[PDB]
Amino acid sequence: KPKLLNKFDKTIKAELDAAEKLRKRGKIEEAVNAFKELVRKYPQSPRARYGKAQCEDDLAEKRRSNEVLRGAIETYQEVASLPDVPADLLKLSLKRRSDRQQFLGHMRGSLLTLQRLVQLFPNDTSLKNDLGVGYLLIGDNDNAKKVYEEVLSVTPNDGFAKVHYGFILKAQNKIAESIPYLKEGIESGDPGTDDGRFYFHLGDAMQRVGNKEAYKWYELGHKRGHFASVWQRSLYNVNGLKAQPWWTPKETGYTELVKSLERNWKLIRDEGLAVMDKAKGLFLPEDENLREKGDWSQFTLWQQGRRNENACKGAPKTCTLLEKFPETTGCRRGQIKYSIMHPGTHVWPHTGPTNCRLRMHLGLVIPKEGCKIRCANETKTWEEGKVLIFDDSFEHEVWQDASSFRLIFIVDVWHPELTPQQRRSLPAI
Amino acid sequence: GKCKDGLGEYTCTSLEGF
Numbered sequence: 311k312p313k314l315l316n317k318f319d320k321t322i323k324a325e326l327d328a329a330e331k332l333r334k335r336g337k338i339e340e341a342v343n344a345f346k347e348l349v350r351k352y353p354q355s356p357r358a359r360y361g362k363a364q365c366e367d368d369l370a371e372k373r374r375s376n377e378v379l380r381g382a383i384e385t386y387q388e389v390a391s392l393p394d395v396p397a398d399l400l401k402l403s404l405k406r407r408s409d410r411q412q413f414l415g416h417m418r419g420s421l422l423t424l425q426r427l428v429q430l431f432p433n434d435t436s437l438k439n440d441l442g443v444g445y446l447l448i449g450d451n452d453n454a455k456k457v458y459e460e461v462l463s464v465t466p467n468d469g470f471a472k473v474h475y476g477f478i479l480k481a482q483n484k485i486a487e488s489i490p491y492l493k494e495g496i497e498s499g500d501p502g503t504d505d506g507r508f509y510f511h512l513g514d515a516m517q518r519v520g521n522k523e524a525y526k527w528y529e530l531g532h533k534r535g536h537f538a539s540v541w542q543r544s545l546y547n548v549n550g551l552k553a554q555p556w557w558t559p560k561e562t563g564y565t566e567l568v569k570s571l572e573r574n575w576k577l578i579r580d581e582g583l584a585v586m587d588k589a590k591g592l593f594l595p596e597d598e599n600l601r602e603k604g605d606w607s608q609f610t611l612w613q614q615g616r617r618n619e620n621a622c623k624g625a626p627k628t629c630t631l632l633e634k635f636p637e638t639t640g641c642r643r644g645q646i647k648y649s650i651m652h653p654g655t656h657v658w659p660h661t662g663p664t665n666c667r668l669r670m671h672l673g674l675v676i677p678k679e680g681c682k683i684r685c686a687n688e689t690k691t692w693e694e695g696k697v698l699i700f701d702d703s704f705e706h707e708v709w710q711d712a713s714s715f716r717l718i719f720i721v722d723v724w725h726p727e728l729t730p731q732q733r734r735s736l737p738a739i
Numbered sequence: 740g741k742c743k744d745g746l747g748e749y750t751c752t753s754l755e756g757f
């Protein structure tokens with residue numbers, strides 16, 4: 311269907327087809343050489359150059375080589391520099407360039423390629439949508455938002471733009487504003503809208519405004535395979551891990567870790583209090599829009615399986631204690647952190663990103679009344695010197711209505727059914 | 740931004756190729 315051959319390339323189609331047939335048969339090394347010779351003999355051929363780039367792309371896949379792929383990314387760019395490139399080929403080549411740049415984490419490079427695409431094809435709405443994704447991936451929600459505003463001003467019912475616009479509104483705490491965009495966008499069924507992130511945030515925005523339809527959207531998201539269940543809505547999962555809101559120490563197998571936390575709880579408490587008193591700036595306010603109201607701050611010792619050396623200067627005995635337990639200090643999908651919460655706090659129902667961790671809470675200073683935590687359909691309270699364990703990939707919710715502060719110590723561990731192989735290979739979160 | 744407690748970022752993992 312796409313017209314890839316300019317006038318000259320039609321005259322060498324027999325040679326171009328022969329080289330591409332080698333690639334399609336999986337003879338990647340031969341195909342590379344065939345297209346390289348065509349590039350040698352016909353240096354201005356866009357199809358020979360795209361053939362070279364595609365073969366390098368395949369070769370990078372075969373060798374699992376970032377460097378080979380960087381070569382392909384450059385050759386895709388070379389295509390665009392040649393004279394007389396057909397429009398369909400120019401778009402295919404630069405789009406693949408951007409896609410592979412994103413794969414490598416070259417987000418600024420992808421952004422430049424996407425900006426070029428939009429300049430070359432100013433009426434192509436899909437390319438503007440791709441540009442918005444480029445901004446989202448580099449953390450530039452303001453420019454992403456302007457992009458989807460421009461798309462929606464020309465094509466108001468573009469469902470891809472609606473769900474991404476809604477995602478951005480939601481992330482900016484424009485909850486009510488986000489719901490119709492997320493909802494209409496999912497309902498469009500446009501390509502790219504059947505995505506767990508949009509079900510997740512539509513249901514959550516509805517929950518925050520008291521719309522009871524939320525769980526109908528969680529049910530649909532479960533039925534379409536985005537969530538393990540209506541209750542457990544994490545999006546970075548290893549399928550099949552035992553799924554249970556509340557866990558006993560014995561069920562986790564981390565009984566030595568729990569015994570150490572409980573036997574030594576006062577030293578952990580005392581270093582947390584010393585930081586509250588003498589280094590309170592180490593407690594950073596929660597920053598993921600998870601509070602309806604109130605004051606909640608966290609002092610993080612480990613994140614993504616990496617020790618914060620400076621934080622551990624503030625709690626050196628606690629960091630020494632925990633170094634003996636790599637099931638938490640090496641949990642690259644978890645943290646180790648103090649968590650202080652003050653009266654008048656309500657934490658919105660929410661879920662963590664991954665079913666690959668369980669979350670331990672050690673009580674340090676627990677007022678006798680007013681503090682509780684719900685996970686799924688079950689609500690509990692903390693006790694000083696005692697560990698609670700839940701799976702925070704289940705929806706959970708917290709209230710602090712005491713008359714003084716409440717301090718806990720949060721210790722994430724790898725899910726106990728994950729093998730050492732899985733724990734070494736999962737991307738950090 | 741990192742997805743520490745929630746799922747608020749567009750992507751929670753880093754891209755580093757193969």
Ligand SMILES: O=C(O)CCC(=O)C(=O)O
Pocket residue numbers: 649650651657669683702706708718720744
């Ligand atoms: O109670 C707390 O300090 C934190 C509650 C929470 O959302 C969690 O531990 O994931």
Ligand SMILES: [Mn+2]
Pocket residue numbers: 660661662702706744
């Ligand atoms: Mn939480």
